[model samples]
Target: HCHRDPLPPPGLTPERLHARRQLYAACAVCFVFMAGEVVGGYLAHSLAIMTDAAHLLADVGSMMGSLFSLWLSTRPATRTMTFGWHRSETLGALASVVSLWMVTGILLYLAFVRLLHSDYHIEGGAMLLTASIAVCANLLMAFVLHQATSVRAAFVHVLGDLLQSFGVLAASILIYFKPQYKAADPISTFLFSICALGSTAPTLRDVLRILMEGTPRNVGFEPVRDTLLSVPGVRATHELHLWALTLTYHVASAHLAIDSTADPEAVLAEASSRLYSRFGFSSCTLQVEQYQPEMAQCLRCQEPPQA
Candidate 1:
């Protein structure tokens, strides 16, 4: 995606600092609960609980990844890392997705184990209590993370964790009640995996697309085309492109054909100003190309198109 100037979110203020603090605090709680769940499951010898604990382990990793990403996100751009590690947040999103995939794979394995080995037993009640505690704690964390628009990806991570815990809780209840359905154990595990994947995959893909510098989905092609063409002294725009560097940053680039009556320098400034005001793009590069027969001659016109 293009690295346009960032668009500050609507209705933002110092209040976002509070959200940042809450996100960190909630991350701590999630990390602690995951540790406790692991220890408790080991002490209780509940396969269901142990398996749920595995999922929580990934939750802990993902939360820590998010915390680090948020911290790195604040640094100013230096000569190195040109974008100042803004992509770290997208990496955090990728971490969440990979964590989910890991959990899903583990659950799949456990499902098979439970189905094949009838010897393996589950302490359904113990699993139920432990998973219930995780659910409560994760819900509290999710509540805290939900307060800010800036932290949507991190909030989604917390929400995914909350869903995993709840899935375990529901599965535990079923196993406790219907011990006869030996299949319940495997089925429940599979369902939890499905829940985890369903929540995380799209988020991961979207973040990846942004890091790959794909066009911004919100600002479509047609409207941008019209906007550029509307500028005075601009006959048309070619190779027009727009996309985000991360969730918080945007960029765009294009080539403009100068109109017969237009002053090139004035038109360039006006075009850039209009882009910023109308489209909320800050970082833009426009190649002011005069009418040249050779420029149009190249089918793959590559004038170092701005990224």
Candidate 2:
């Protein structure tokens, strides 16, 4: 009797749905130009150009993993599997990104060893042209993604790509105009590999938190508690937990103090409304406990939640 009418599933909002579509356009644009990036790098005898190719691969890997997870999400949860197939998507994304990172790492080693000596015949003309094209393509993505422009992930990732394109273009200009500074090729490659690795670190931080079962960093405990306390039936709120099932979805649980002044079912419904509407929690388990005046001093009392 401690539940309300089941609420509607929180489907994608208009903005979120648009974000997905805009990113797909960016991915496709990158896909075509990335081939141009690879071939020009190979012919230019420039590791720096190759580094851009690998950088583009990083972009591709991330989107590919997301696509796989979206596809995998279709398989619904089963009884024995419990929260079936949700975590599977997280691991799937991790696997793809790591595999690509490792493979591109070998390219980083090649550029590193090449840097130990100055032996290069770089054709900067081709590199310059490719880089110019790359810069335009990146700009194209940024300008076209008007809806996603305000989205943090879209802005950061695209801006990073543009930055690397500028680096590659700069190196090409230097080595082409002055053949003596051939080291610029490998040096820029090294520089960009570091940048590429920088991007991966963020991914690692997110993945590690999920593995550790830590609370989502952006989610504040006080915020959840404050919101829960606002529920009309909840006299006092305790035991709150919030966590991401993956980057895509979140889960939460809590125990609320139910005074006899209000019905258990009614209070629980109000609480659920706040959590889902305010915090966008898709799956949460909540319980109502009879408020005892003495229990206020229960030192062992902990907020009950596994969000």
Candidate 3:
């Protein structure tokens, strides 16, 4: 017979529901600015402005993907999707990172080409105005989505946009003062590309870690093992496995050897409470067994018995 905790482990909470609305609002902010920047880029005839606009376009797309993924992630679990749709957020993050890398590569190449042949002339006043607007808009959206863990990829995108907008503003100011430094446009583009590339590494590492089923960095195996064993009736625990379904949702399972004289139900409840309280695991599966030497030996042995 199986022993399960009556108090359900927490999954997506109200904060996450609030986060979804913030993300939607942030995406709307991004799209609104993106359209203006596209038109501004064409009118100003500034490659830097155009490139920034293009990156914003990519950001808009990433935001939309994040929204769709978040929706899927909130759906209830089924027989086929046992873990629910939580991993969709991670998948969306991976896609966003990949798109950011591609944009970075393209920006870098174009910057280098511009340096070699500086044929472009930027309307500094218009570029500065457009970039300033972008900075304000992105900063606002970033603030709104600051606490959203599920859409970290989209957060990173907005952060990149904010920084790039500042870079563009700097380039425009420099060019306005000294028109001969036409190369400033490309130089600033390269600098912003480097920054964008740097920002994605942490998000990429997190997404890859989740996809690989690596234990959440915040929770340690030794601590969990020690804690499980420290409980009153638990003799030992083996096959302890822990992983995150998403950044906020965690899952764990193990085989626990308990004192034969102790009550299994109480032990299960205590273990479950300890795991939830200490490690924030949202789901746990525990198999409790009364310790027996011969049975334990049989379970431990890998080789088959002689016929």
Specify the highest-lDDT model's number. 3
Better of 2 and 3 by TM-score: 3
In candidate 1, what are the lDDT values of residues 65-152, reduced to their tens digit?
Answer: 7668766766668887776777777777687677668767876886787777666666666766777787888787678766544468
lDDT: worst 10-residue window of model 2: 1-10
Relative to the true structure, candidate 2 reaches a TM of: 0.75
lDDT of each residue in 1-307, candidate 2, tens digit only: 3334464355556775675675677578667777988888887787877888777776776777676666566566788777757776678668766876785688778877887775657777877787788888878776665453345677777787788788778888888889788888777877777767776778788887986776777777888888988877677766677888887678898878877788987777778877877877768888889888865878656564546
lDDT of 3 by residue, 1-307 (tens): 2324345545878887887786687667667787888777666655677667667766676777778887786567999998788887788788888987887788788778878866677777777777777777778878876854456866786686677788787877788778787888787777667766786789999989988988898998888988898989887666788899888989998888898889988898888888878987878888998876654565652222334
Clashing pairs in 2: 239-303, 239-304, 241-307, 242-307, 243-307
Q: Residue pairs in steric clash, candidate 3?
A: none
Model 2 RMSD, rounded to 1 decimal? 4.6
- lDDT of each candidate versus the true structure: 0.70, 0.75, 0.77
Comparing 1 with 2 on lDDT, the higher-scoring candidate is: 2
Better of 1 and 2 by TM-score: 1
Candidate 2 ranges with C-alpha deviation above 4 Å: 1-26, 84-89, 96-100, 124-129, 132-160, 229-239, 257-262, 291-300, 303-307
